[PDB]
Design a protein around this ligand. Sequence first.
Ligand code: DGD
Ligand code: CLA
Ligand code: CLA
Ligand code: CLA
Ligand code: CLA
Ligand code: BCR
Ligand code: CA
Ligand code: FE2
Lengths: 62, 448, 35, 34, 37, 335, 28, 77, 340
Amino acid sequence: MTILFQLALAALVILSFVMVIGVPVAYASPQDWDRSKQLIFLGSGLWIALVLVVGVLNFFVV
Amino acid sequence: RDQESSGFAWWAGNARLINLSGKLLGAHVAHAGLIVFWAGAMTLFELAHFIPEKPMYEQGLILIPHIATLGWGVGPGGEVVDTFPFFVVGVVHLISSAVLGFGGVYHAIRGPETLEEYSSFFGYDWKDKNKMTTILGFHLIVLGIGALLLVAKAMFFGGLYDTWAPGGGDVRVITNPTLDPRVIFGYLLKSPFGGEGWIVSVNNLEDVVGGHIWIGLICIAGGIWHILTTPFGWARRAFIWSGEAYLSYSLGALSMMGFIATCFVWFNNTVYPSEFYGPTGPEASQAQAMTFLIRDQKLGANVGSAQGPTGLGKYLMRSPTGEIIFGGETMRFWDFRGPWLEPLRGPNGLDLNKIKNDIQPWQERRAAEYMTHAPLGSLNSVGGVATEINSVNFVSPRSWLATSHFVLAFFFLVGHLWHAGRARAAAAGFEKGIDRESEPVLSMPSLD
Amino acid sequence: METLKITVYIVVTFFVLLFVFGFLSGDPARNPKRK
Amino acid sequence: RIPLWIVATVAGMGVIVIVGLFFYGAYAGLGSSL
Amino acid sequence: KLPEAYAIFDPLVDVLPVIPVLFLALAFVWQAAVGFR
Amino acid sequence: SANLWERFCNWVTSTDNRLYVGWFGVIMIPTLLAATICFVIAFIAAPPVDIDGIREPVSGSLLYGNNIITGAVVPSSNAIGLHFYPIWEAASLDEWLYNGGPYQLIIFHFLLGASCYMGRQWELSYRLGMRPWICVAYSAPLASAFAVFLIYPIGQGSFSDGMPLGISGTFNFMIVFQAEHNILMHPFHQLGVAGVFGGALFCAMHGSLVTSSLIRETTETESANYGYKFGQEEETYNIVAAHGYFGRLIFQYASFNNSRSLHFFLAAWPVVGVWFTALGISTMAFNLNGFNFNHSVIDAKGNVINTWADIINRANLGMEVMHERNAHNFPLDLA
Amino acid sequence: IAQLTMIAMIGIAGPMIIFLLAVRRGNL
Amino acid sequence: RPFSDIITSVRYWVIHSITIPALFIAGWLFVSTGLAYDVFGTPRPDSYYAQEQRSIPLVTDRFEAKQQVETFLEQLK
Amino acid sequence: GWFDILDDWLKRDRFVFVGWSGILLFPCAYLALGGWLTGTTFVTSWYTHGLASSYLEGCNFLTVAVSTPANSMGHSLLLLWGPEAQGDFTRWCQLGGLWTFIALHGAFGLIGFMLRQFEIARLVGVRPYNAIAFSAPIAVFVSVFLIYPLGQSSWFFAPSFGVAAIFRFLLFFQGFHNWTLNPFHMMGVAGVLGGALLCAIHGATVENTLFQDGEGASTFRAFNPTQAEETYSMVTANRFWSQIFGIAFSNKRWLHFFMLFVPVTGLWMSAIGVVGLALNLRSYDFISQEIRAAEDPEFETFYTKNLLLNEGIRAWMAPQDQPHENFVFPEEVLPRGNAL
Ligand SMILES: CCCCCCCCCCCCCCCCCC(=O)OC[C@H](CO[C@@H]1O[C@H](COC2O[C@H](CO)[C@H](O)[C@H](O)[C@H]2O)[C@H](O)[C@H](O)[C@H]1O)OC(=O)CCCCCCCCCCCCCCCCC
Ligand code: CLA
Ligand code: CLA
Ligand code: CLA
Ligand code: CLA
Ligand SMILES: CC1=C(/C=C/C(C)=C/C=C/C(C)=C/C=C/C=C(C)/C=C/C=C(C)/C=C/C2=C(C)CCCC2(C)C)C(C)(C)CCC1
Ligand SMILES: [Ca+2]
Ligand SMILES: [Fe+2]
């Protein structure tokens, strides 16, 4: 539960760091954002579940 | 390039977006992200350093005290009970910053560079008196709902921190908002000088809550009215209709609100509880008088008849209209009112009998606390007078807030003048120079 | 003394009206070109 | 060659770092008060 | 007091506040890269 | 009559008036005449003012023992604080002159008018087809009068703490300020002197460079000034020769060749610097003072090793400890 | 202790997201 | 040679990546080795006063000044 | 002849023009700047003023400084190899040799620089009004950092090189010389203050009175580096001010000469005032005022008030500001108002 929480919360940080540097260069070079429109979508969708994971999961650790 | 030097100069870059609704939206959506980001990211910074058993004002906090006022995580006398509401408000914002930031970045580098075509509902025309009056109308409602979002938290969801609390400062549920217009709007007809203080003289939560009820409605009402209308005639023959001109008007508006805010945090006791922020400027000078009238009185001195160097009254003297006030340079703050000091006031001001035997210990230490926490300090945060020694690292939150906002408020008034001056020359059309050919001055008679 | 207050008040109103009803009078109009 | 805009943003952060070290030194050094 | 669990992020949260400033800064890294057009 | 009011508005706004009485002017001209007329009478004949509210009148007018250098119009009483004190608020003038009533009548009308004076510096520029912004340069000196005559008093809780209207009275405002705020040790004041020093500096630079690179068109025994006619087409100095010299004094890229960029800098510098100085006084009006490095450097045992910052504190204490002799009754100066 | 580790990365991040664009050359 | 060109030449950095930090580490050591204190007669945190004394080592006469200064260092100042 | 070859070389148009003048300017100018930067970070003022004065001791950019020599030194030039330091370097440092070093060097450096202007002017063939102007700053430096202390007991009372170390020079002058009340200091400020006005006012008048010579908003590019027409409407400017202020220029040649005059005259006056403060011939009091204040205890002006501020400054500062006087002022002798 705890490590499980620190995983979700900690991974959620690296995804953000990755997501943050990503989306930019994404819409940036139109070399796609059609193939990456796929990547970004998964990052975005993923992120939300994560927040919800850490959200609900918070009430069990603290 | 979509927009380069053959638009505007680099350092005026953002003016190249004056006519690209879409991108000009990314900016506003990306920016609004930075504010949430800050609000969120700062709260957690504050909480990360926050020490429960210690005054908030002694910790350089300015957001946690904003939450505390709305009745959150605090209780009797501003005692911090649960730090959760703080952590919450902080993280939530921080998250929403990512959501907004997404949209901003998106609308500014991928999505449509203009809106008018990718949807005529959102696209807009500056000179479109109706689109303008309407979008303005939408926002006038969003803000109106917000004003009620407060009225709700106070009347239904928990309350607010009322320092004037009968049993002594405490979170209280307002269930009797002053709705009497005669009173509510009375405030606007109040002098802004000593005594009558205008808006900043609000001193009880009923009026605060009550007044917000009026604003919420009055506000949404105008939101609908603009949705359903166009500027009349004068409204049109009076203003300038352009992208800059509109900005300017909103610039002068913030400036003014910036000055009003500076005075609120500096003077007001109610919506800015001295329990979370520090004691007010006047409140602290008052407390010194309290402290020493209290001390010396214990040493056997008759405060009522004590004569000071000038023959005016070491501890108590009279104001210009006859009321009994504290003496000393503190005669200038005789307009200070405060929970801790009120029980000593009579129908004629400070009552010599109560002062003589009704002073309570909690008051003595309140006066002492506030006396030693006046809003005096240095840039490098060394609490006290400029000649003081290093040791007590402190600068009242009320000083920080007040200065920061006077600077911002000011520069914005310059911003106003600047963008308004540009708009008027832009309109008539000479903001780029005098027509070498038709030089106006040259067609006017010599005054010599 | 209560009079002077009245007078002063009147006097300041005059000018303040003259001021508002002034810029109201289509001030943008007044200038070299575009109006 | 080395792109100018990079020479700058690098030499730049480089200064905020040294000048920032000075600001830290103000709450620890001898110029402290503790 | 960063709830017990998140304590591991205390240090992280210590720098978050300053980020906004960075953006105003970046805008300059950019223009420099794009040769002040 | 094309319509009286229609006409009135055409006159007021007329750009053919010797002095452009504008719309802002309609407020300016009267307020400024009151401020000026009340001042001149005050400064010459007003009687002593109990500035510190401690019944210890300070006479500051010529007829009551003052000379131009010492004389001044004294600030309203401290007994009054921030309260509004219009003549119609006094049992009599005798009472009004004693509590420093004239001071408010003056500062309020002046600040009012000096603002409109700004509003006017815009209007005329508009009626003449010239770019605005000049009025924005004047926002700096104005923003100062405001800081020194209103912000500081609001902040400090009394108009009696506003800068007096007189030479020596001003030095008083300064010397005391320094003691209570240690302004010399504040970033904003420093930026202020940079702007003022700099201004005067640059003012001299430009002035000389230009005047020294003027195209000859005058006799050996004829004022070099005549070499210019009001309403010329071409320039009167070799801005390329100017830049040629100045570029060699220091080094080329560190010299202006664009008259427009030169003049922007010329205006930008002082105005920006004074803006900060005005924000300094407006900021120290809420007690956020200058850096306090008292007893910072201490030795290995704990002894206090003085710096010039300390020698400055002593001079400040002297001021603190002696100003307002009889006005204090308690330990801390919180007002 | 030394969360300077943090800053550092989020610091070279800003310039990175434009540099990679200087490489993939496009849209600056 | 136009600064721009030089500040960009890989030769430049190849040279200064060595030279610059060189100078830096040198000055650093200048302070960190206590050498600077002796080059400038500047007191170390433990050398302003003698343990007990609270008086200042004020130089009081020009000509026999150097001599007087030396004696001030004597009282373990 | 080698001379003309030496010349040839010097007057060669480089990036940083050398010239004959440089033979004096650069050696000094660099030494002055160098000595400051050195002392600021390394040399102390303990043996001199009982003060920590360098980064090495803990001072920050505001509190650091190259403090004057002891009062014992008197007006000694304090040469590295003179009777004081005796060739020794470290001692020199501790006796404040670095002050007369920076002082005297920088002094020659201002001579060299003005000469430069004069030399470069001549070559480029322009009038030397840039040199005339620079006389003003020389006068200030000369009267304040040299003439002044030359009239006092020693270099010790000259302004020490440093930020804060200069603020005390200001406070001192108020407190001891009541300098703000001096007719010459006033003219001084009227000029610097008035000069920083012409600067700002003229600049804005130009930028907002410009003709349109481009189609852009950023009108900077629209400028003809190669003369021709006036870039701003001198005729419009005249009418503007003539209607808002009542008075207005109308002869750029005069408007610009005026700009040289105002601040250079101001600084010259502020200098004379100080040349007088050297002999302590100050503008301290108004006798008629003092006489009435003596006989009549209820007479009070903003002037009398000030003089009391001075008494406090002198009494509370003198002790740690003039160490060589071994001042001891018992608590009971210290002037103080009530409570404070
Ligand atoms: C026309 C063009 C105009 C262009 C205008 C441009 C304007 C640009 C403005 C830029 C920046 C404004 C910055 C404001 C900074 C405020 C810094 C501050 O509050 O900082 C606070 C800190 C704290 O200092 C520390 O303060 C500390 C202690 O406080 C305390 O700590 C103690 C325990 O340690 C006790 O607890 C005690 O009670 C408590 O108060 C300790 O004393 C330390 O020893 C001490 O070092 O600042 C320090 O260290 C500071 C070291 C500072 C050096 C500062 C220089 C500042 C400005 C220089 C300007 C030059 C301008 C030239 C202009 C030319 C032309 C325009
Ligand atoms: C503070 C907010 C702000 C915003 C929102 C903008 C926005 C914009 N600017 Mg300005 N600008 C600013 C400040 C700002 N600017 C400042 C301070 C200056 C002076 C230094 C300028 C000078 C300037 C010029 C000279 C120009 C612009 C232009 C533009 C547009 C450029 C489009 C482009 O090609 O982007 C390029 C962007 C990138 C390569 C990377 C950007 C990364 C940003 C968006 C996000 C960083 C956060 C993070 C990594 C994202 C993660 C989000 C998460 C949810 C996943 C755009 C609408 C141009 C224009 O007029 O276009 C029509 C133009 O020519 N700007
Ligand atoms: C702040 C103002 C703002 C505005 C005016 C717009 C406007 C628009 N957006 Mg953006 N957007 C914003 C912020 C904004 N957006 C932010 C912060 C983000 C980051 C997530 C985005 C991300 C985004 C994407 C990824 C896309 C758009 C698209 C579009 C366009 C869609 C067409 C449409 O009308 O559907 C807008 C859609 C809805 C209204 C339905 C949403 C329903 C649910 C999920 C949310 C309802 C939100 C709100 C709480 C409702 C209040 C109801 C009230 C009764 C209380 C439209 C022009 C699309 C586009 O490219 O168009 C050309 C597109 O693909 N937007
Ligand atoms: C550049 C940085 C900057 C920063 C960091 C700040 C920061 C701050 N400013 Mg400030 N300001 C700035 C620039 C800045 N400002 C500028 C340029 C101006 C123009 C001059 C101003 C003008 C200004 C004014 C006039 C005021 C502030 C105030 C404040 C503080 C407001 C706290 C708050 O809640 O936000 C504001 C938040 C919102 C508008 C969001 C609306 C939220 C509503 C809808 C809901 C609230 C929740 C509800 C009650 C709960 C209900 C729950 C339900 C289930 C019942 C805050 C410290 C205020 C203050 O308290 O000063 C002491 C104040 O009065 N500022
Ligand atoms: C409230 C909203 C607001 C908005 C939306 C704008 C928007 C705009 N302004 Mg404006 N302005 C405002 C308020 C506002 N302003 C105020 C209050 C002032 C008074 C100072 C001004 C004064 C002003 C001027 C003088 C100018 C503009 C201009 C512009 C346009 C600039 C385009 C650009 O690339 O700017 C990006 C801006 C910059 C790169 C400025 C450089 C700022 C540097 C010096 C400091 C940054 C300080 C930082 C916050 C602190 C940390 C510093 C660090 C060293 C420690 C743009 C349309 C320009 C224009 O062409 O207008 C038509 C222009 O010349 N503005
Ligand atoms: C020399 C020079 C210069 C310089 C500059 C510089 C040096 C800059 C820098 C800059 C920088 C250096 C920047 C940066 C930026 C950054 C940013 C903008 C960021 C952001 C971020 C974020 C958003 C993140 C996220 C996160 C994380 C990481 C973790 C936790 C959580 C979160 C998720 C929040 C200029 C141009 C002026 C010009 C002249 C020259
Ligand atoms: Ca932490
Ligand atoms: Fe000029």
